[PDB]
Amino acid sequence: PSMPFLKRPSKLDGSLPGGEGCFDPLGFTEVFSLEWLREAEIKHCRVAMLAVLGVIAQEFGTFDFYNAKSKLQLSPDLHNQFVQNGALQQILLFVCAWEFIVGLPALIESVNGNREPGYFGFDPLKLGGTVGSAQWKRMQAGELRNGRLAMIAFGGFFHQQLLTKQGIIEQLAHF
Amino acid sequence: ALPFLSKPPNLSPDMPGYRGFDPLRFSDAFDVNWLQEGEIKNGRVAMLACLHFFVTEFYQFPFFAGAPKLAGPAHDYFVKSGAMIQILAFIGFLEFLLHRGKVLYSDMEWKGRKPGELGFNPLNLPNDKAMRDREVNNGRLAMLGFAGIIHGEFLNGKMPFEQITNFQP
Amino acid sequence: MNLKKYLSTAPVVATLWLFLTAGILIELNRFFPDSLFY
Amino acid sequence: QVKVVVDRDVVPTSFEKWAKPGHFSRSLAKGPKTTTWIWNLHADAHDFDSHTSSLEEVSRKIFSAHFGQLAIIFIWLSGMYFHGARFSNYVAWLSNPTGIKPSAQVVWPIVGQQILNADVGGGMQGIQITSGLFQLWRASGIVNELQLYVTALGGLGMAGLMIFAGWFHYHKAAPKLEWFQNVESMLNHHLAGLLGLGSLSWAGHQIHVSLPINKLLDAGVAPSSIPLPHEFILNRNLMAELYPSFQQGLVPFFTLNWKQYSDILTFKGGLSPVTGGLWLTDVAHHHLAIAVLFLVAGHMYRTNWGIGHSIKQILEAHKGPLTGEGHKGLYEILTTSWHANLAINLAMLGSLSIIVAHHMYAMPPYPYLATDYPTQLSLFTHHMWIGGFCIVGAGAHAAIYMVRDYSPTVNFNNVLDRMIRHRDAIISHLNWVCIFLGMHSFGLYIHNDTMRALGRAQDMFSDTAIQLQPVFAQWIQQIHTLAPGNTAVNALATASYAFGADTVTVGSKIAMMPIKLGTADFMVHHIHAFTIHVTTLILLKGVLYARNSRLIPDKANLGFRFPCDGPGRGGTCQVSAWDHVFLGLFWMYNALSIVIFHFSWKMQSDVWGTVTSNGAISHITGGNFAQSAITINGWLRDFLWAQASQVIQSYGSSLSAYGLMFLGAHFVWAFSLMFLFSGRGYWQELIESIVWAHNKLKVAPAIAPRALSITQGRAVGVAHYLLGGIATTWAFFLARIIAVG
Amino acid sequence: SALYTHHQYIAGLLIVGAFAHGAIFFIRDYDPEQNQDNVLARMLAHKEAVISHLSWVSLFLGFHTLGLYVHNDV
Amino acid sequence: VLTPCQQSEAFHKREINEVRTLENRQANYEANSPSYLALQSQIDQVHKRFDKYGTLLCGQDGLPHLITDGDWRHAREFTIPALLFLYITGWIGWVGRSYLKYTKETKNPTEQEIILDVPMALKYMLSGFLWPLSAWQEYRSGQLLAKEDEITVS
Numbered sequence A: 001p002s003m004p005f006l007k008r009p010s011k012l013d014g015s016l017p018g019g020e021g022c023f024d025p026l027g028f029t030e031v032f033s034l035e036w037l038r039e040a041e042i043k044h045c046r047v048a049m050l051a052v053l054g055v056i057a058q059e060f061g062t063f064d065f066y067n068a069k070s071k072l073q074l075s076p077d078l079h080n081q082f083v084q085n086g087a088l089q090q091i092l093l094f095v096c097a098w099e100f101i102v103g104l105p106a107l108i109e110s111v112n113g114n115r116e117p118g119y120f121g122f123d124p125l126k127l128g129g130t131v132g133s134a135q136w137k138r139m140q141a142g143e144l145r146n147g148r149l150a151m152i153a154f155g156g157f158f159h160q161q162l163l164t165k166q167g168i169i170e171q172l173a174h175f
Numbered sequence B: 001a002l003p004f005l006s007k008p009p010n011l012s013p014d015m016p017g018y019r020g021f022d023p024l025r026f027s028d029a030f031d032v033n034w035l036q037e038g039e040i041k042n043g044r045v046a047m048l049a050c051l052h053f054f055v056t057e058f059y060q061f062p063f064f065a066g067a068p069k070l071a072g073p074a075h076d077y078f079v080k081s082g083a084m085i086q087i088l089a090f091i092g093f094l095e096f097l098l099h100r101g102k103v104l105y106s107d108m109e110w111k112g113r114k115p116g117e118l119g120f121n122p123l124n125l126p127n128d129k130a131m132r133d134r135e136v137n138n139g140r141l142a143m144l145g146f147a148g149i150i151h152g153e154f155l156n157g158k159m160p161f162e163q164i165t166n167f168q169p
Numbered sequence C: 001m002n003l004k005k006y007l008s009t010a011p012v013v014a015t016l017w018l019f020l021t022a023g024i025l026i027e028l029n030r031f032f033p034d035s036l037f038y
Numbered sequence D: 001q002v003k004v005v006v007d008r009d010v011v012p013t014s015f016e017k018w019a020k021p022g023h024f025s026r027s028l029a030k031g032p033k034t035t036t037w038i039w040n041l042h043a044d045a046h047d048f049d050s051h052t053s054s055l056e057e058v059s060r061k062i063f064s065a066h067f068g069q070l071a072i073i074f075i076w077l078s079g080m081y082f083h084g085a086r087f088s089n090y091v092a093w094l095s096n097p098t099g100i101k102p103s104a105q106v107v108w109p110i111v112g113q114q115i116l117n118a119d120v121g122g123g124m125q126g127i128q129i130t131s132g133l134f135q136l137w138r139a140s141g142i143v144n145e146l147q148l149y150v151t152a153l154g155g156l157g158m159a160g161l162m163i164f165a166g167w168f169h170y171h172k173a174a175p176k177l178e179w180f181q182n183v184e185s186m187l188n189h190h191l192a193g194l195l196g197l198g199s200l201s202w203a204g205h206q207i208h209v210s211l212p213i214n215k216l217l218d219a220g221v222a223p224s225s226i227p228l229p230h231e232f233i234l235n236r237n238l239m240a241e242l243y244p245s246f247q248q249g250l251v252p253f254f255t256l257n258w259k260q261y262s263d264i265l266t267f268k269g270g271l272s273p274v275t276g277g278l279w280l281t282d283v284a285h286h287h288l289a290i291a292v293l294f295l296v297a298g299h300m301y302r303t304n305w306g307i308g309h310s311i312k313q314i315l316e317a318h319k320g321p322l323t324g325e326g327h328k329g330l331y332e333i334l335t336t337s338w339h340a341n342l343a344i345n346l347a348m349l350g351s352l353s354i355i356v357a358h359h360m361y362a363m364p365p366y367p368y369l370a371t372d373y374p375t376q377l378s379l380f381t382h383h384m385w386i387g388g389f390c391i392v393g394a395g396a397h398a399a400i401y402m403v404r405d406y407s408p409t410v411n412f413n414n415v416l417d418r419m420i421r422h423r424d425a426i427i428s429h430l431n432w433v434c435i436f437l438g439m440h441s442f443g444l445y446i447h448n449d450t451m452r453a454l455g456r457a458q459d460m461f462s463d464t465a466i467q468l469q470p471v472f473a474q475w476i477q478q479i480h481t482l483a484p485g486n487t488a489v490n491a492l493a494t495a496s497y498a499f500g501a502d503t504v505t506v507g508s509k510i511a512m513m514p515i516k517l518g519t520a521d522f523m524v525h526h527i528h529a530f531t532i533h534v535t536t537l538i539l540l541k542g543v544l545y546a547r548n549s550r551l552i553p554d555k556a557n558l559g560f561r562f563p564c565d566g567p568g569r570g571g572t573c574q575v576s577a578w579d580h581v582f583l584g585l586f587w588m589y590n591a592l593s594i595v596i597f598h599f600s601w602k603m604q605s606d607v608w609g610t611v612t613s614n615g616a617i618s619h620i621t622g623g624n625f626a627q628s629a630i631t632i633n634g635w636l637r638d639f640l641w642a643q644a645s646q647v648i649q650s651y652g653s654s655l656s657a658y659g660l661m662f663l664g665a666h667f668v669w670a671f672s673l674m675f676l677f678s679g680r681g682y683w684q685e686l687i688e689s690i691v692w693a694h695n696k697l698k699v700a701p702a703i704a705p706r707a708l709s710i711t712q713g714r715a716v717g718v719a720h721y722l723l724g725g726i727a728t729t730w731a732f733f734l735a736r737i738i739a740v741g
Numbered sequence E: 001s002a003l004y005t006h007h008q009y010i011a012g013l014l015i016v017g018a019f020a021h022g023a024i025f026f027i028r029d030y031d032p033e034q035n036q037d038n039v040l041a042r043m044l045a046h047k048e049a050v051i052s053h054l055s056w057v058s059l060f061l062g063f064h065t066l067g068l069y070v071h072n073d074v
Numbered sequence F: 001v002l003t004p005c006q007q008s009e010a011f012h013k014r015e016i017n018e019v020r021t022l023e024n025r026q027a028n029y030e031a032n033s034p035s036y037l038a039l040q041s042q043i044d045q046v047h048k049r050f051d052k053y054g055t056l057l058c059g060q061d062g063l064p065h066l067i068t069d070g071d072w073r074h075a076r077e078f079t080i081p082a083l084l085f086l087y088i089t090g091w092i093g094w095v096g097r098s099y100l101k102y103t104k105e106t107k108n109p110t111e112q113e114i115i116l117d118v119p120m121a122l123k124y125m126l127s128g129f130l131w132p133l134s135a136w137q138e139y140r141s142g143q144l145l146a147k148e149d150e151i152t153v154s
């Protein structure tokens, strides 16, 4: 098939930046028109890369004056420390300023089909921010791969709780 | 102007203060010239209104109030004292002559190329040039700074002034 | 594209206005409850 | 044969046609020149056999619409599981159920209405449940809040699968009609696949969840020492302690040594004396009986493998002499006309819901259900009321078949229209039975009313006076006493304790007492047979005179929702097959209003109440039925004057919202009469006399303000007469039994 | 308490009769040619204002007894 | 006789009776129950409720009556929300009249009323703020009214 897999040869996609191929074994692009899903893939992979760098950076010891970590999940020590602090509200609310205000119409631009649904502009880099064909697509696939690895990697950075009950660095300090 | 192809609204680029920004497409349905007039007027009266929060310092306290730097119940201090009704008489009896059509969306008097009425302009060094843009930036800045002074008076309540020096929550 | 026409119909804008003024009454009756003066 | 042909990309999914209201009807896409277009927009929103005669497009529309209905039901049950999770006192209710009154909904604190938050115990207040969700969760074995949250989120998950399923089955994969007229497969999967695997899998839940959990809660274990239903399947050892037949595994099942499964499954009947519910051994064994019995039942319809029946060769084979043709045509009626299927399924669905009510009051199947009497009342009453309305839906959609989808070529001399040949002899004998039962069901009440009012109580119909002891019901109830030794050989107790032995009490609350039926209960059963026969009169007159009466011999040429013909024939108001359904809704209100006024007052006199020291008895009214149901002043006084007193004095307390939904429902009931009595020949130029007052001030509305039409101007009188009339008894009933029970 | 309610229901009956023979007067007894622009013809002329304002004052009271009674009852 | 309500006896009888009656449920909970804090807030909302009705007139019933004469001592009772209200539905009525005399002269006035043109709607919603001296100046042009509209036989 056009897939590098069992068989479903180019159900709808293939020209998108999956450089190792078009994966799609379950019928989502069959009936979801794929642009919504591409925005969901890219937005989840961006926020997952911020998630995994958040977990690592919080495990490398930074607090102005707060509670010590011992984990970075399981709400009433970490997550529901800051909600009752009245602290994570605004860092959600500016995301509301990002999503409802300048992300929801952009998603509308990612419905009518004039978006290429990454692309909030945003290249503050000289000598390497090629907007064109080669480096833009081969770097968009790199954002995509490191973002997907951030998605599963953040799954593993969450679910080391039952036989861990500890950090990830202290998971490395035991086997 | 906003990069993700969100720039065919009902606006026009030759309008003063233009920088290409309406993601929630309020330019549609709301008469872009009247919205421009509302941004100009909110900017100017917000501009004066936060200028009052800079002239709460010792100058010009003529015998009537004696209670400076309150900014909260100061509204209660001058509603209670009276004559803020009379400053609505001052603004109301001016503004009838400012616009002369004086109704919000019905019959906006688009005559003089610009939301600026009669040229209240005795000094009159610029005309309606790109000085209008640096009126708009000094209007929007004086909107958000006005809000920051008031919410600084809300939760802290300490100082409109001395939050700038070394005072932090 | 034509969703905003559906959000301009009679019952939907009836709910987006009576919901709104309903919230004016309820949010104006949580902040100042028992208001028989003025 | 059986094959599934599915159109793909049927309808595009833009919001374009949402901007065209009334896109669907070419009779209604003209746009509103009048305001009657507004209401006809909603009266034609689901006339699917009026959009287009093409049954393929109709059948796609309905089959996709069912998923919208199931989507609203999964939003509803996910709502009940979340209000059970975050807002209810269910975790505290699980500790002591007979003391803590069940509450989920916790009223937001605005002006005054925070007083509706009833301090029902559990440390946390809120308005009291009467729907009985906590009893179904204790039966289902939900221990803590976590299963309520997770099952709520799975409820939203299935709601998403039903929205996506309905969108998927109207727009981008929608089937052909040949899929739909493949009905032996439809029965073949609903008897077996839906109900068979439903009852079988539910027997799985009860045996592997409820039997250990409601053995532990029957033993009185606090809801912290109870292990999860999780932990009963990692090892059989936690269940072999509870039920020692799990130690043998499935080996006695496959060797058919089913005597070994007497621990898990049995046939005991009766009630649990500790929880006041049915034995879940009996209930799990029961769902196994529905399991094997329905999986037997599903496989009698030949689909592809040439094994099974077809409905055609069944209905042809009953070629009886007094019908002539036999049932020839009914497989072509019921697979081409949807409205006839809706008539049958609403009749059997509604009568099933009535059966549900009668089987829930006397065999209370949930633990601690008969203890809290409001959940025992309102689950009789609610299922009785939808169980009513669905029968009028049968009487309507039978007529909607007879007006639209009747065709005499397929339907010639069969069992169907041979009724309509002698529909005078149908409706005339219903007329006679209605008069005979009205005299002998209500003339007895005017009799006892007069004889009690004339002083001569020696001439009444009481037990002391001329008695009317129900012979047959007492005899067969005496058979039901003699069941579990004689005929139900392997039983222990009877089918209920409404039949046989002495009462079952849980927490000094009478769960079920043997109901005594003497000479007043008799006459109320003749009320019920009477007002059932009147609805059968109006809903068979609505069907046999649906298509072509002898008054008006062209009704199919006029339609179903036509108002009338005219003042000719001396006046032919209210003559359509819809107008009989208009009448059968009022008689629905009558018939069920005296069903529940039999229920909630015989079982406040003969069953419910408390028990005191030495097993002594105390009812709520205190045996005050047979000396008082025989009259109407005893009925109205001793029931509607006396039981109202806890609804009426309910102000200043948490029962005052029923004191608002009591008066406001009297308002809506009384407000229907304005629509029922008057008509649009008044209101149209009353309104136009107001249109002068808008034309004077230039406030003429561009959609022209008509009055309502006639059929809307009586349909709304039904829908207020029933909303106000039903919500009166709603607020009266829940404010009565919450105030005591 | 019997005389009061007696003469009140008789009173309302007799008003309703006076208006009912009002309508019998305007149908089976009214001649708008001997009443050429007369006071009765003037009454039939502006009757839209009369019905608009009885409908107005009725609509004012019925939202302001039921408004105030449902307010006091809530 | 309407006593001033802050000193009437049956008024303060209702104060003791409702603070005590609602207070009876407050001893059903511990010192840190959420319901106990809720009834703290409710007791506060009863003492504020009875102090903020001080300048009313509760007679022998102990219930605060009102006066609708325009006595100017009872102006906050009736006439200030009277003029306030008449301003609000004069706003609403002038908005609706102005929008109907918009859609009366459009392409298709039927489709204008199902689907409200929220551009022109929210034009007239906000522009109808000063309806006394705008409706009055459109009355002086002889344009608020009409003449020779529809009528029956005579």
Ligand code: CLA
Binding pocket: D063, D066, D067, D070, D179, D180, D182, D183, D185, D186, D189, D190, D192, D193, D194
């Ligand atoms: C054994 C298979 C099976 C099962 C379980 C069902 C179950 C159901 N059918 Mg159904 N049906 C089947 C086969 C089956 N059908 C076949 C073969 C035909 C064609 C002859 C039809 C034709 C048909 C019609 C025309 C209608 C139904 C309807 C219904 C629903 C009745 C409402 C109810 O009880 O809610 C209880 C709800 C549940 C128990 C949830 C059930 C969900 C589980 C996961 C089973 C669904 C599996 C699904 C059918 C598999 C599709 C394959 C696909 C994913 C590849 C119920 C969900 C009615 C309805 O409401 O439409 C949806 C309806 O109008 N069915």
Ligand code: CLA
Binding pocket: D430, D431, D434, D435, D436, D437, D438, D439, D442, D443, D446, D534, D537, D538, D583, D586, D587
């Ligand atoms: C309380 C008011 C009331 C009463 C008494 C009735 C009574 C009746 N309705 Mg009914 N109906 C009512 C309200 C009422 N309706 C309302 C409000 C609606 C609105 C939807 C309808 C709609 C309706 C329909 C649609 C139909 C009926 C029918 C009937 C008759 C059923 C047969 C029967 O019971 O005969 C027995 C009679 C009685 C129980 C009445 C009391 C008779 C007493 C017991 C004996 C006689 C008294 C006395 C001795 C007379 C002699 C003395 C006198 C001459 C001086 C019955 C006469 C059906 C019909 O036509 O008949 C089958 C029918 O199809 N009704």
Ligand code: CLA
Binding pocket: D439, D440, D442, D443, D444, D446, D447, D450, D459
């Ligand atoms: C419809 C219900 C009903 C019934 C069953 C009765 C029955 C009775 N009433 Mg009565 N009553 C009723 C309604 C009813 N009432 C109403 C509605 C009122 C108020 C208007 C009254 C007011 C009233 C008074 C004031 C008194 C009674 C009294 C009585 C008793 C004697 C009357 C008598 O001699 O019967 C006469 C009976 C007949 C003439 C028989 C005719 C009917 C026969 C049985 C039909 C048989 C047909 C047959 C089955 C055909 C098939 C077979 C064939 C084909 C071969 C009797 C128990 C009296 C009493 O003292 O009570 C003890 C008395 O003083 N009643």
Ligand code: CLA
Binding pocket: D667, D668, D670, D671, D672, D673, D674, D675, D677, D678, D686, E055, E056, E058, E059, E060, E061, E062, E063, E066
């Ligand atoms: C409970 C019974 C009831 C009620 C309330 C009314 C009320 C009214 N009738 Mg009436 N009527 C009745 C029975 C009733 N009638 C009966 C039995 C008859 C004999 C058939 C008539 C015959 C009749 C005639 C012939 C006329 C009236 C007229 C009127 C109106 C008088 C003007 C007025 O007071 O408006 C005030 C408005 C009200 C009292 C309406 C009630 C307030 C509502 C409930 C609030 C609005 C809805 C609320 C928010 C709930 C929303 C519901 C929810 C689904 C969202 C008024 C609506 C006249 C009319 O049109 O006047 C203009 C007229 O000419 N009536």
Ligand code: CLA
Binding pocket: D689, D690, D693, D694, D697, D699, E052, E053, E055, E056, E059, F092, F093, F094, F095, F096, F097, F099, F100, F116, F121, F124, F125
């Ligand atoms: C366009 C808005 C509008 C305006 C200005 C008026 C104005 C008037 N109506 Mg009214 N009316 C309206 C809408 C309006 N109506 C609607 C929508 C209905 C149907 C419910 C009625 C039903 C009605 C009746 C039945 C009667 C009047 C009467 C009157 C007159 C007396 C005032 C009164 O009591 O009003 C009555 C007010 C109501 C019944 C309730 C108000 C109606 C709605 C809720 C508010 C209207 C706002 C509007 C929908 C906003 C839409 C435009 C906006 C989206 C841009 C007055 C000329 C009476 C008359 O003839 O007196 C001389 C009379 O008897 N009206």
Ligand SMILES: CC1=C(/C=C/C(C)=C/C=C/C(C)=C/C=C/C=C(C)/C=C/C=C(C)/C=C/C2=C[C@H](C)[C@H](O)CC2(C)C)C(C)(C)C[C@@H](O)C1
Binding pocket: B047, B048, B050, B051, B120, B121, B122, B123, B124, B125, B138, B141, B142, B144, B145, B146, B147, B148, B149, B152, B159, B160, B161, B163, B164
């Ligand atoms: C938010 C936070 C900040 C505030 C941050 C912002 C920056 C606040 C400051 C905002 C500034 C921009 C206010 C600007 C005021 C400008 C005044 C009002 C201009 C007045 C001109 C008027 C008089 C009109 C003049 C006509 C001009 C023209 C010449 C005509 O011919 C005639 C004539 C004279 C009428 C801090 C850190 C500074 C302080 C904190 O407490 C709060």
Ligand SMILES: CC1=C(/C=C/C(C)=C/C=C/C(C)=C/C=C/C=C(C)/C=C/C=C(C)/C=C/C2=C(C)CCCC2(C)C)C(C)(C)CCC1
Binding pocket: E015, E018, E019, E021, E022, E023, E025
């Ligand atoms: C207190 C007093 C007084 C006053 C009073 C008065 C006098 C009042 C007025 C009022 C009045 C006294 C009124 C009346 C009423 C009446 C009525 C009630 C009428 C109406 C009518 C009817 C009812 C009918 C109608 C009609 C029609 C419809 C048609 C034709 C015509 C007619 C008219 C017949 C006096 C001064 C004495 C003195 C002192 C004391």
Ligand SMILES: CC1=C(C/C=C(\C)CCC[C@H](C)CCC[C@H](C)CCCC(C)C)C(=O)c2ccccc2C1=O
Binding pocket: C014, D674, D675, D676, D678, D679, D680, D683, D706, D707, D708, D709, D710, D712, D713, D714
């Ligand atoms: C009162 C009455 C009417 C009049 C009912 C009128 C026409 C309907 C009044 C209610 C409608 C819904 C008012 C329309 C108002 C719109 C909802 C807009 C209002 C703004 C917001 C509430 C959305 C009949 O048309 C009628 C017909 C046949 C028999 C009896 C009667 C009858 O008794």
